[PDB]
């Protein structure tokens, strides 16, 4: 009371099954539009007036749903066919529209790397401690990252990015890294990361000290 | 075909009045409902209001109002969709719907930060480790304010492994990532730099990467 959003929020499936969106209104409506609008580029349209048609949509999208739910089935999902899709209605008061559904083509699980570099010297003399441990090539999306140094655990200063997804491996890349200063890097010793994934039991952990150089 | 696309703008001082550019010309001219569709990097789409020519007839939205004055020109054919007495929410993607059945005919978009900002220079710290087959290696960017940032890697030679990271946001400063692979065989044995530079700036940074 009162937002209206698509229903299920994160979808994967791979080539070759069912992809049915559902819609979800906060108000009842009669023509509902529903869009393709891919990452970093301007939205599409893709199905108008709950079923019809688009300009380069292909013949296998179908679409109803009348009332205050939705629903755009993709018969047999394709390479063509991984976008975030929104709805929309207008309005007269608009609702207003969702946020949009985010899939991804689905594959076999893959276990990434986790590359920790040590700061170099000019970081240290400019008064810098950034310590980073990249994960590369990882499939799912989910980690429940750790980062614990000497022992204790530590989640101060600790940032996540996401570089999206990819055409070739289609895998997906993070860059798991924390910032300190450069008082705090010389009281600790092993710098180190353990990656939680669901492909592997024990995740991959490499060290490496500040007393050789 | 509609043509072209939409304008740019950047970082205004504080009081002073930008004005968006939406130069579609597609005509059907001119009765239709261009509707300014707003998203920001939460992934939610908005929308800012729409204007209609004929007679002159604009609109508003409860999060917008105050005064988002969407001005119509039928002589340039623009449509105007910039909000006045701002904050800094308004960094965020500003579209142009065109009017039919759906909103089918967009435009590409430009994305306005708004503040009283100050432009800092870029810094290019050295990330390589003191084995294996494959190396992955990169260069940290820390701090620089306005979201205008360059990535490379050896101008357009080396660009297979980059993967492109978020600058995402801690104490009010972009720190983004560009980590590609190298073999063996040509590390150390041609000299990989990594060149990134800052538009609004003007400031170009370079650092050639050696083993430590």
């Known amino acids: 009371d009162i937002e209206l959003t698509q229903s299920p929020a994160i979808m994967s499936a791979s080539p070759g099954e069912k992809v049915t969106m559902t819609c979800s209104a906060s108000?009842?409506?009669?023509?509902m539009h529903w869009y393709q609008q891919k990452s970093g580029t301007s939205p599409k349209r893709w199905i108008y007036?709950?079923?019809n048609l688009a300009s380069g949509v292909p013949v296998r999208f179908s679409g109803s749903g009348s009332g205050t739910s939705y629903s755009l089935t993709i018969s047999s999902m394709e390479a063509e066919d991984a976008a975030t899709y929104y709805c929309?209605?207008?309005?007269?008061?608009?609702?207003?529209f969702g946020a949009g559904t985010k899939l991804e083509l689905k594959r076999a699980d893959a276990a990434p790397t986790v590359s920790i570099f040590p700061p170099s010297s000019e970081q240290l003399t400019s008064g810098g401690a950034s310590v980073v441990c990249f994960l590369n090539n990882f499939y799912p999306k989910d980690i429940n990252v750790k980062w614990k140094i000497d022992g204790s655990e530590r989640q101060n200063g600790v940032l996540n990015s996401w570089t999206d997804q990819d055409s070739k491996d289609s895998t997906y890349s993070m860059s798991s890294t924390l910032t300190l200063t450069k008082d705090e890097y010389e009281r600790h010793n092993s710098y180190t990361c353990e990656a939680t994934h669901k492909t592997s039991t024990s995740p991959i952990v490499k060290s490496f000290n500040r007393n050789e150089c | 075909q509609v043509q072209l696309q939409q304008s740019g703008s950047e970082l205004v001082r504080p009081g002073a009045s930008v004005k968006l550019s939406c130069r579609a010309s597609?005509?059907?001219?001119?009765?239709?409902?261009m509707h300014w569709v707003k998203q920001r990097p939460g992934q939610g789409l908005e929308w800012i209001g729409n204007?209609?020519?004929?007679?002159?007839?604009?609109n508003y939205d409860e999060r917008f109002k105050s005064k988002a004055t969407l001005t119509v020109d039928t002589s340039s054919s623009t449509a105007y969709m910039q909000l006045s007495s701002l904050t800094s929410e308004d960094s965020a993607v500003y579209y142009c719907?065109?009017?039919?059945?759906?909103?089918?005919?967009w435009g590409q978009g430009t994305t306005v930060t708004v503040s009283s900002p100050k432009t800092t220079p870029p810094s290019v710290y050295p990330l390589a480790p003191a084995a294996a087959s494959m190396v992955t290696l990169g260069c940290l960017v820390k701090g620089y304010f306005p979201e205008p940032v360059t990535v490379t890697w050896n101008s357009g030679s080396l660009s297979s492994g980059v993967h492109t990271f978020p600058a995402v946001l801690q104490s009010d400063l972009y720190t983004l990532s560009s980590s590609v692979t190298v073999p063996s065989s040509t590390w150390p044995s041609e000299t990989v730099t990594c060149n990134v530079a800052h538009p609004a700036s003007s400031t170009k940074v370079d650092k050639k990467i050696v083993p430590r």
């Open positions: 719907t065109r009017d039919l059945r759906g909103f089918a005919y």
């Open positions: 597609g005509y059907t001219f001119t009765t239709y409902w």
């Open positions: 204007i209609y020519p004929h007679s002159g007839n604009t």
């Open positions: 108000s009842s409506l009669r023509y």
């Open positions: 007036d709950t079923y």
């Open positions: 929309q209605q207008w309005s007269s008061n608009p609702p207003t």
